[PDB]
Amino acid sequence: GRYIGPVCRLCRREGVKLYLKGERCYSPKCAMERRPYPPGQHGQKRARRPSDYAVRLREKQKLRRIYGISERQFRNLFEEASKKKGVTGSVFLGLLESRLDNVVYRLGFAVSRRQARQLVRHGHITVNGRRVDLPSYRVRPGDEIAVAEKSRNLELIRQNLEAMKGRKVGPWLSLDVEGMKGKFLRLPDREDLALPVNEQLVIEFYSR
């Protein structure tokens, strides 16, 4: 299924902190502080001028790497975001962002999107009152996502919530923190969320 295993070797390969991990990527590792170079033997060698395709390849790889999503699923969305009444880059991002697993991390119920996914899929999340297991669920404006009552104790979440105080969620979102719930107000912009990604490149990549 979804990528398993060494994640900070991606942080490194792409050459930007993707924050695919939890807090550790905010500490002085991420792997990124110690060794800000690509993995394996050759990482400390002088780079060569990257190919035009290479450039688009990585940009796409990064963006995908971020939401930690399969190339199958990822391509769907991009084709979905193609036609597209839309500016097509943005549309793609909105959709990516609408993922229940993405939103849950965005709403800080969980620290890492990889942690978000197990959260959704173990029964520890609810959409509009309903239990929802599937990280790929597309949320739309007005949706109330919340920790299910069945386990609201769950040291992990309370820890993630009680520490979520001291934080302010993205504009398109809102979170009531004493109630273990939150709401999806709208679709995030290009502006609304800055990503390391150049979205104009991911499009040029599927131009093939």
Binding site: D52, K84, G86, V87, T88, G89, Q200, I203, E204, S207
Partner: protein, 151 residues
């Protein structure tokens, strides 16, 4: 302020009794992404020099590129020798659809959204030279009316 991009570097050769002696061409684009671009073809005995005069010659040859919304006024086509470029404008949200040579040129001046096809000889030197003369002849309603008035 200005931005350089090289689309091509060639080693060519002449023959002397000795053997092959080489020389280097360099194709360079120059532009501010504000609607100014230029193209020049440098040749000297080593790469950097030839990339240097490439940039140099570039700036001494330029073009008015009448963008509107990051695209072009009308659909144009030009031929330079046997090479041909068709330039068609696009709505916003499209992107620049081009092969490496005309992409580079179209990018360094405006043009967030365009449609192109190369036809004929795809030789990049002559396709580049065909693109410049293609921008060069772009015209707007302004030029159009000021062209047909009288007096």
């Amino acid at each position: 302020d200005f931005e350089e991009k090289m689309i091509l570097i060639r080693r060519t050769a002449r023959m002397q009794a000795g053997g092959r002696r080489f020389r280097f061409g360099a194709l360079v684009v120059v532009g501010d992404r504000q609607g100014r671009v230029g193209l020049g073809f440098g040749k000297a005995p080593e790469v950097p020099l030839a990339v240097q005069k490439a940039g140099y010659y570039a700036r001494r040859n330029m073009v008015e590129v009448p963008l509107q919304n990051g695209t072009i006024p009308h659909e144009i086509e030009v031929e330079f020798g046997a090479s041909k470029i068709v330039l068609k404008p696009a709505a916003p949200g499209t992107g620049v659809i081009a092969g490496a040579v005309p992409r580079a040129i179209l990018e360094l001046a405006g043009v967030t959204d365009i449609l192109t096809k190369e036809l004929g000889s795809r030789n990049p030197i002559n396709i580049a030279y065909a693109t410049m003369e293609a921008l060069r002849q772009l015209r707007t309603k302004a030029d159009v009316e000021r062209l047909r008035k009288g007096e």
